[PDB]
Write a protein that binds this ligand. Structure first.
Ligand SMILES: COc1cccc2c1C(=O)c1c(O)c3c(c(O)c1C2=O)C[C@@](O)(C(=O)CO)C[C@@H]3O[C@H]1C[C@H](N)[C@@H](O)[C@H](C)O1
Lengths: 1022, 150, 50, 50, 50
């Protein structure tokens, strides 16, 4: 081919232009986004029932509701919690890469049936069904700075006026509110109300028909009478639409012309719907609005546009409406991106400079430099051709690739300025015969190569994906290169292609170097010993080298964990937050840019007891060293945050890839299996746990991820008496209910927007068991009785939250592997410890530990198939079940250079490093092929003699190898390997190669020629 | 889709079905007329009965099996237990009661429900102690029921 | 009997919500006196209706 | 599926009451397993006459 | 605070408008380049295209 191309090289430039054009369209046509989509698609199922408690949600709710999720398609496992405030989550994670639209349907649309026995309280607030993701794009916040706006007025307004703003913009995959929107609140007081002989009920019904919408004919429309002329539309009753109109309800009339309004029994007011999440940002009333991708738009444009939109519109509604951004995943990309093409770009530059040095020239260093770029640019429309997209995984995907792009270029031009030097024809046959000796080699080192990459797009789950990112990238990059070096390079440099010591001073060490080696090869098998050492030793390292996923990275935000004890309460958890605000604003001004904390969330389950506080730091810039960054800022916090009360406050940096498989940790759910109840399970739960901590050997930190039985104050209606006293068990129940958990009457419309109305007694009358009393039912005769009449109080313990693994009660426990030990050998103890527990009690794995378990280990079988097809290819570049066997024993030489990222640097075997550890066994075994080709080429052609060849064949190679080897090792040591911020996977990417490259040379030069003969002669023996 | 399409429509007759249909939910599904497969489950030591099994089975294993890909309908050769109130007329004719009566009972004395709680959700000036208020539960044994007061 | 009444009651809601949804080109509703409402979505061509 | 069903139950077998055995009547799987293997033997086999 | 868009035919129409001045461009360029490869002459095309 490159012969028929060197010829018309006017063509191999058209070709070089489409390929190029196609990465411009494709650069444009490309998604961009911090990561891609790598978690399995969960649907969560949210439910609320104002004032339940667990059993009362579990058994009014979860269940059944379970019971009937039953004939959706690809589902993996389901859990489910039911906790003490109404709520029911119920995620259902699904098989690998289903259809999310299609799951979610189905999931839901099979909800649709469900409902019928969901109870009228729930049916009304909606169950919504929707998609995993509970952190993405940015989180705008909306603050006051007057003391004008409470939460709710801020939440309202946001909901009133901007929430759809935003939620319709190029991107914007849905909006979600950090508040409510006004509520017709309506706070009863059994006093001002027993005075009228009225229960909440009559408050309830009153608000019902005083505020509804009633049908009403037109005037004709239907069949009318001969010759009419009037059609209109009659307009009966209409929703109330204020605090006023509401205060005017005839709840009663006594014979005195008596005027018992609503506000005479309560107090109307614009309120919020839920009252139990206190959001502030910097000491300050808050009401954010979270907002996610858009599925196939661009983190970068998108943020812009949302910044945009806000900007057009804060010219509006009074006071301070200051709009903060206390989270953006925007920098963290851009700043990556910028530093990524910084890498490529410069790793070229370096080619050019490491191109004077090796070739006195210029129109040859001008080659690698219009060929990489043409290999990249097309590796942009391969990506866009398998959908992919621009994200931190894919990016580094071609940086851990640079090495092999580059190399392939210098590799060709430089075979030309060997053969057009060493007594040779012009460009013409220089190339033709040059290209010729690499031609086959160049191809065939596709195959072999692809085989040490492809594999990797086959892996497990959540993980597998990351890999596939990397896998394609490299392939379609690398495999792109080959093709472009058999076509634009042969004919490129063949068409432009024609110190004071270094030149002859390299032509020195070369000679000196092959001597050395000529003795190596007298002795022969001498060094094969000094090799098995280097094998053996890798083996010691592999094992020693710690494991992981993606080294954490500083993201300019992290979190604080407040977690007040058992029965806590809001007021008293704020104070905590205020300190975790202060001891962040004060003892850390040069770094805290904004605390945004909120109580009633701490994703361990909700309730005045717990908040959580996300702080967002100032720019990495203004954060100099170690101490001024996260690991470090959080270091100090955490420790400075114990000394605090009896309120556990943690801080921690977000994990790499938010939505994904954190710690190398395990996830362990205890399921229930029979009758055993909450209690029995609680028994198992505890035994197992206690077990576990008497085994710090296998190391550990088992925890129940979930909550203790707390105490419960329990009314307990006395049916007899209630009949007996002439008092309907509905009226009791209700009145207790709406006094205390509130109930939600009907809606009404508020400056244009239907908005719920809630009825529930002021707080004053609802705080202490001791108030039960204030509360009085009308009974059958106009006799207003009280509690003690027909009810009795008792404390109990029970659950605030209640666990259930697919269909059925379940706990949840998670702990770490073992300073010492492997996630896998640790699973397996925790499962023996699980082996020997009270029958009934099952146990099964979730998260991460379905991944790791299921697929889990496959390194093996997938590598067999490379180390196999590496051979089968390689041998037919050669004709030999034996000669290939010399190109292989390279593999280790490259490994140990890599793996001394152990004992020079504080690192661990992790995707960023394996992917390196791949990229290095490319360069390496292709050194191997080229070389052992050149050593073939002689012998096969002009019989140039058993070793005569080996010595000559390295003799003609030590440049190329030393050439790129030099490009790269500088190519990687830049910021890559030394870096302040937006980094980490930087360190990861480099340190890998950087070290693994060293030896991949420094060992290679000597061994490979060894290898060649050691094997070509052994195979023709005695 | 089809499975889809079908239940778009359905869905606009929910709200005309009799509450009692309704409420034993309607189902839509896709699958094969014939059976994939039948899974006996007998018991060795005559330790439980025909009944007993069919409860255990429904309580135990009709779950997962229906919830579980391309399993798309498990018949169940049996039925799960239910609270049972084999009436007798004579009597309610005697003490002067109809099922209607009996029924309304059954909803009242057998029922789960929803207080509120003491640290009152939007609370007051300045308060420690918050915790839920539990009232009526859901009955739970042969016994609870028919001690229901008529 | 309800003019704006509908538009704010069903129509609005149903709209606030019509975000996310891929390939969507433009949406176009209208209340009604008789209280009927038609939200309408229309997506970039050759998109997959089902 | 069958495999999955079967190794569901299989997953809930150490915890039934006293003496309760999934038995296995009418199941249409293993023929389509045997059968389709029956053939396979034939391929190899008549490799060996040829 | 008032404005407009088009719908159906129109928004198709306008969309089909402003598209031509790319539809021509790119199509040209594709031929020109084809000719190059074909007639091995970074010059012969120039002709043809003129
Ligand atoms: C498994 O999902 C998660 C996991 C962990 C912790 C969290 C979440 C989570 O999803 C989550 C939220 O989705 C929301 C919030 C939130 O704090 C979390 C998590 O903490 C805070 C929020 O309630 C406010 O800040 C309101 O003032 C807004 C928002 O509400 C969402 C979630 C509701 N359940 C949903 O029905 C509503 C419309 O949007």
């Amino acid at each position: 081919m490159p012969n028929f191309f060197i010829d018309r090289p006017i063509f191999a430039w058209v070709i070089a232009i489409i390929i190029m054009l196609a990465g411009g369209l494709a650069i444009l046509k490309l998604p961009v986004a911090q990561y891609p989509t790598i978690a399995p698609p969960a649907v969560t199922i949210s439910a609320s029932y104002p004032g339940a408690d667990a059993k009362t949600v579990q058994d009014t709710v979860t269940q059944v509701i379970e019971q009937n999720m039953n004939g959706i398609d690809n589902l993996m496992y389901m859990s489910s919690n039911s906790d003490s405030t109404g709520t029911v989550q119920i995620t259902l994670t699904f098989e690998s890469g289903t259809d999310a639209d299609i799951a979610q349907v189905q999931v839901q649309n099979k909800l649709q049936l469900a409902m019928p026995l969901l109870p009228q309280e729930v049916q009304q607030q909606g169950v919504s069904v929707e998609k995993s993701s509970s952190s993405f794009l940015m989180v705008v916040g909306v603050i006051n700075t007057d003391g004008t706006m409470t939460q709710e007025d801020i939440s309202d307004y946001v909901a009133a006026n901007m929430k759809d703003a935003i939620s319709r913009t190029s991107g914007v995959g849905d909006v979600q509110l950090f508040g409510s929107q006004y509520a017709m609140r309506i706070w009863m007081n059994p006093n001002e109300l027993n005075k009228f002989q009225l229960t909440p009920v009559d408050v309830i019904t009153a608000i019902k028909a005083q505020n509804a919408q009633v049908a009403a004919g037109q005037l004709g429309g239907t069949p009318p009478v001969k010759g009419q002329q009037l059609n209109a539309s009659i307009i009966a009753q209409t929703r109330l639409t204020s605090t006023e109109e509401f205060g005017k309800i005839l709840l009663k009339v006594n014979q005195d012309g008596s005027r018992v309004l609503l506000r005479d029994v309560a107090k109307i007011e614009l309120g919020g719907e839920n009252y139990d999440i206190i959001a502030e940002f910097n000491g300050q009333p808050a009401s954010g609005l979270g907002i996610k991708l858009a599925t196939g738009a661009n983190a970068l444009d998108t943020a812009a546009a949302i910044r945009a939109e806000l900007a057009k519109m804060e010219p509006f509604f009074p006071s301070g409406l200051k709009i903060v951004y206390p989270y953006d995943t925007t920098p963290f990309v851009k700043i990556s991106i910028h530093e990524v093409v910084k890498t490529l770009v410069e790793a070229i530059i370096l080619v050019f400079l490491v191109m004077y040095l090796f070739l006195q020239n210029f129109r040859a260093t001008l080659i690698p430099t219009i060929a990489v770029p043409v290999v990249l640019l097309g590796t942009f429309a391969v990506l866009a051709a398998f959908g992919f997209s621009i994200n931190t995984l894919t990016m580094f995907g071609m940086v851990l690739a640079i090495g092999l792009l580059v190399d392939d270029a210098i590799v060709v031009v430089e075979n030309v300025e060997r053969v057009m030097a060493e007594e040779g024809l012009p460009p013409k046959e220089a190339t033709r015969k040059s290209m010729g000796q690499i031609q086959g080699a160049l191809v065939g080192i596709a195959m072999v190569l692809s085989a040490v990459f492809v594999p990797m797009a086959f892996f497990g789950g959540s993980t597998g994906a990351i890999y596939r990112q990397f896998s394609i990238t490299i392939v379609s990059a690398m495999a792109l290169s080959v093709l472009v070096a058999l076509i634009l390079t042969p004919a490129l440099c063949a068409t432009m292609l024609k110190f004071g010591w270094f030149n002859r001073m390299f032509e020195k060490s070369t000679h000196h170097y092959t001597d050395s080696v000529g003795g190596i090869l007298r002795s022969t098998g001498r060094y094969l010993v000094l090799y098995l050492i280097i094998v053996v030793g890798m083996a010691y390292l592999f094992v020693r080298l710690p494991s992981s996923f993606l080294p954490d990275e500083d993201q300019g935000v992290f979190m604080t964990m407040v977690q007040l004890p058992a029965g806590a309460t809001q007021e008293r958890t704020q104070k905590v937050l205020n300190e975790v605000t202060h001891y962040y604003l004060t003892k850390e001004k040069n770094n805290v840019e904004s605390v945004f904390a909120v109580n009633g969330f701490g994703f361990a389950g909700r309730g005045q007891n717990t908040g959580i506080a996300f702080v967002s730091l100032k720019d990495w810039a203004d954060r100099p060293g170690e101490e001024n960054k996260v690991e470090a800022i959080t270091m100090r916090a955490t420790r400075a945050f114990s000394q605090i009360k009896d309120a556990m406050v943690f801080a921690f940096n977000l994990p790499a890839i938010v939505e994904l498989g954190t710690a190398t940790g395990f996830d362990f759910e205890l399921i229930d299996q029979a009758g055993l109840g909450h209690e029995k399970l609680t028994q198992a739960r505890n035994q197992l746990l206690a077990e576990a901590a008497k085994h710090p050997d296998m190391l550990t930190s088992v925890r129940p991820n979930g909550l203790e039985d707390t105490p419960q104050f329990k009314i307990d209606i006395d049916q007899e008496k209630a009949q007996a006293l002439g008092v309907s068990i509905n009226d009791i129940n209700t009145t207790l209910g709406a006094a205390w958990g509130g109930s939600y009457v009907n809606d009404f419309i508020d400056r244009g927007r239907v908005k719920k109305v809630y009825v529930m007694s002021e707080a004053k009358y609802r705080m202490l068991p001791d108030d039960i009393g204030d509360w009085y039912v009308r009974a059958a005769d106009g006799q207003m009785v009280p509690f003690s009449a027909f009810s009795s109080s008792r404390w109990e313990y029970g659950s605030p939250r209640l666990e259930r693994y697919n269909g059925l009660p379940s706990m949840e426990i998670l702990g770490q592997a073992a300073p010492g030990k492997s996630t896998g050998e640790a699973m397996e103890l925790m499962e023996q410890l699980a082996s020997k527990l009270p029958t009934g009690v099952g146990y099964d794995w979730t998260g991460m530990s379905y991944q790791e378990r299921l697929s889990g280990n496959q390194a093996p079988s997938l590598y067999a198939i490379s180390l196999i097809v590496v051979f089968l290819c390689l041998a037919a570049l050669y004709e030999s079940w034996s000669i290939p066997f010399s190109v292989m024993l390279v593999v280790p030489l490259g490994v140990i250079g890599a793996l001394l990222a152990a004992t020079f640097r504080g690192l661990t075997n992790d995707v960023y490093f394996q992917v390196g550890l791949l990229t290095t066994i490319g360069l390496s075994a292709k050194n191997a092929i080229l070389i052992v080709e050149f050593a073939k080429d002689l012998m096969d052609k002009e019989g140039k003699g058993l070793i005569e060849a080996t010595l000559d064949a390295v003799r003609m190679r030590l440049r190329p190898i030393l050439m790129t080897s030099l490009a790269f090792i500088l190519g990687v040591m830049p910021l890559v390997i030394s870096t302040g911020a937006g980094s980490g996977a930087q360190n990861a990417v480099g340190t890998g190669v950087m070290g693994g490259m060293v030896t991949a040379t420094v060992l290679a030069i000597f061994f490979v020629p060894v290898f060649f003969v050691v094997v070509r002669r052994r195979f023709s023996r005695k």
